[PDB]
Symmetry: C3
Subunit: 98 residues, 3 copies
């Protein structure tokens, strides 16, 4: 029966080796996954930097438009004011004739 | 001869234990990868939310500039119209003199 | 000693099996991680394409504002120039009366 116990063990070992050989394939997979997570982390960081640049630039353009709006509204106000003054000079030139 | 079978079993086993001890290291590397994937997934989502904000804001500014453009074109044409009416009052005043 | 050597071996084998069963639980975890890294990679790319769109559009609005600026400032200068020539016609009309 010793000899049966031994044949039994030899089968278990053969099975075990076949299971281990399948499991060993994981080593290379895990390392590959680890490498791919790093690459993703590098792309994520680069997107974050580029989103920041865009955010900054949206904000400056927004400010820029606000400065332009003011600049123009003030020149328009000043031009309308000159026009009003000229209309008043023409009222007086008209009264001065008649 | 049994005894020889037993020694070669004991070396097969010694070898298996060394293989299993290497493979054991994978349990914690996999935990780590899983944690790092979650972190990356959190950053991806934050970038996605920030890209959305930026897209929204680009779109409002673009509309804003369009409103400002027309707003200005109208005031400029009102001004040109007042100028023309002044040019006509001066044609009169010149006539009215001679 | 033989039968003792055998009962020892059988429990070393029992433990290797327990260790292997613990390690076989990684197989699907590693597959799941791999699938999740691919998903993340897909989201990263999508974000990259949307950042590029946003970048392009920020830049065109920026240029657009620059074109609008000069367009208006030239129109305003032309209006100021018509106003000045109208002031001069009114200086003449005033001198022509008195
Ligand atoms: Cl990832
Ligand atoms: Cl993994
Ligand atoms: Cl991203
Ligand atoms: Cl963006």
């Amino acid at each position: 029966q010793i000899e049966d116990k031994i044949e039994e063990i030899l089968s278990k070992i053969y099975h075990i080796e076949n299971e281990i050989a399948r499991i060993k394939k994981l080593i290379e997979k895990v390392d590959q996954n680890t490498a791919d997570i790093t690459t993703n982390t590098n792309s994520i960081n680069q997107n974050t930097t580029d989103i920041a640049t865009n955010t900054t630039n949206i904000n400056n353009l927004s400010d820029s438009i606000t400065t332009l709006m003011k600049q123009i509204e003030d020149k328009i106000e000043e031009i309308l004011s000159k026009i009003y003054h000229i209309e008043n000079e023409i009222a007086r030139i008209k009264k001065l004739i008649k």
